[PDB]
Design an enzyme around this catalytic site. Sequence first.
Site, short mmCIF file in Angstrom:
data_model
loop_
_atom_site.label_atom_id
_atom_site.label_comp_id
_atom_site.label_asym_id
_atom_site.label_seq_id
_atom_site.Cartn_x
_atom_site.Cartn_y
_atom_site.Cartn_z
N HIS A 1 -7.14 -14.09 17.91
CA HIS A 1 -5.83 -14.71 18.23
C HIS A 1 -5.87 -16.23 18.08
O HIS A 1 -5.52 -16.94 19.00
CB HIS A 1 -5.38 -14.27 19.62
CG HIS A 1 -4.89 -12.86 19.66
ND1 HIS A 1 -5.63 -11.85 20.20
CD2 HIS A 1 -3.72 -12.31 19.25
CE1 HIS A 1 -4.94 -10.72 20.14
NE2 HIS A 1 -3.77 -10.98 19.56
N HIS B 1 -4.80 -16.34 12.43
CA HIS B 1 -3.87 -15.23 12.75
C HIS B 1 -2.43 -15.73 12.61
O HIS B 1 -1.62 -15.03 12.00
CB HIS B 1 -4.14 -14.68 14.15
CG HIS B 1 -3.14 -13.66 14.58
ND1 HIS B 1 -3.03 -12.44 13.96
CD2 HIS B 1 -2.23 -13.66 15.57
CE1 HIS B 1 -2.09 -11.73 14.55
NE2 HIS B 1 -1.57 -12.47 15.53
N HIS C 1 3.80 -17.53 17.53
CA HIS C 1 3.96 -16.28 18.31
C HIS C 1 2.78 -16.06 19.26
O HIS C 1 2.96 -15.27 20.21
CB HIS C 1 4.21 -15.08 17.40
CG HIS C 1 2.97 -14.45 16.88
ND1 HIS C 1 2.29 -14.95 15.80
CD2 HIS C 1 2.28 -13.36 17.30
CE1 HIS C 1 1.23 -14.19 15.58
NE2 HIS C 1 1.20 -13.20 16.49
N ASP C 2 1.63 -16.68 19.03
CA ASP C 2 0.44 -16.48 19.91
C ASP C 2 -0.10 -17.83 20.42
O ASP C 2 -1.26 -17.88 20.85
CB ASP C 2 -0.64 -15.67 19.19
CG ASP C 2 -0.49 -14.17 19.33
OD1 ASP C 2 0.09 -13.72 20.34
OD2 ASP C 2 -0.95 -13.44 18.44
MG LIG Z 1 0.42 -11.81 20.80
ZN LIG Z 2 -0.30 -11.90 17.15
#
Ligand SMILES: [Mg+2]
Ligand SMILES: [Zn+2]
Length: 313
Positions: free
Chosen positions: A68, A72, A106-107
Amino acid sequence: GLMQFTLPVRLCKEIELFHFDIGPFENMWPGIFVYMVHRSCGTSCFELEKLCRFIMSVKKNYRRVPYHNWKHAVTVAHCMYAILQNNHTLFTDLERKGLLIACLCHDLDHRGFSNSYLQKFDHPLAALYSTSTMEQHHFSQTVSILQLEGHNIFSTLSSSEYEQVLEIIRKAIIATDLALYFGNRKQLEEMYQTGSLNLNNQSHRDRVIGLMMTACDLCSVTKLWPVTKLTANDIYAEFWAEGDEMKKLGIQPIPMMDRDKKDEVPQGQLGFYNAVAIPCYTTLTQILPPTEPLLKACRDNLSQWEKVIRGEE
Ligand SMILES: [Mg+2]
Ligand SMILES: [Zn+2]
Ligand SMILES: Cc1nc2ccccc2nc1CCc1nc(N2CCCC2)nn1C
């Protein structure tokens, strides 16, 4: 203004394909992302100076975890780029702008632990956000960075357009909570099959963008087998660390997170491809026909995990 980003020939051609790998050279990932925004949105969507400054603050707020991480983020944005480019006319100017940014963000500030571990650890974030714990944090970090001086890439948008794009980004990021994917895809399946699915219905678009976000977030399963296999090592390095942490709290982790159950990985991948990946790219191909290469590539990798079980590798 007259400044195009270009990529070397092999990247210029391969970046248009769903199965593109962004490669091991970190310093090219921002240029790759800008290139995608310019071709997907226009050279006029964002002030270059502000975009570059936003990209670098986002990068700084991804951590050095095995899966993550910043790679990614750019991988998930490239998949979204491939979807948007193969479905030109289906998406608004605001959606094109919003969704590439949503994927990059998003992360944000992910620690390599699931919502379940946060809740069992009793992490402060789990008291602030009872469900989709990390995903509400990720959106919260997006807003933070958007509000840093010189970072408002959306400054040219009207008050209401600005609010619409932040609402697209919020739903898009919340949808990356896989606990929400199952219900979301069930509804989309039924709606497509009864013929009730209507892309002028804002709540129907929301669901469709939500499925795209799951599709992009899982796109590791749609790559060439060696990318897919090697990414799986990073995924399990996070899960097994989380399993270790669960055991430290005095909790037997689920098998997926237990490093003592390494031997079952091939079977766990099968389950995941059948329960999550295949159904996901199936429904997505039904709703968006030109995304079929993701389904085809997913099925190819399922067949590769079957081969691993059969002792043929
Ligand atoms: Mg996530
Ligand atoms: Zn993700
Ligand atoms: C959650 C998840 N997301 C992925 C996203 C992209 C690519 C691969 C991914 N792989 C997984 C792990 C799937 C899984 N492994 C196992 N094990 C049970 C015993 C050993 C393995 N169970 N399950 C469900």
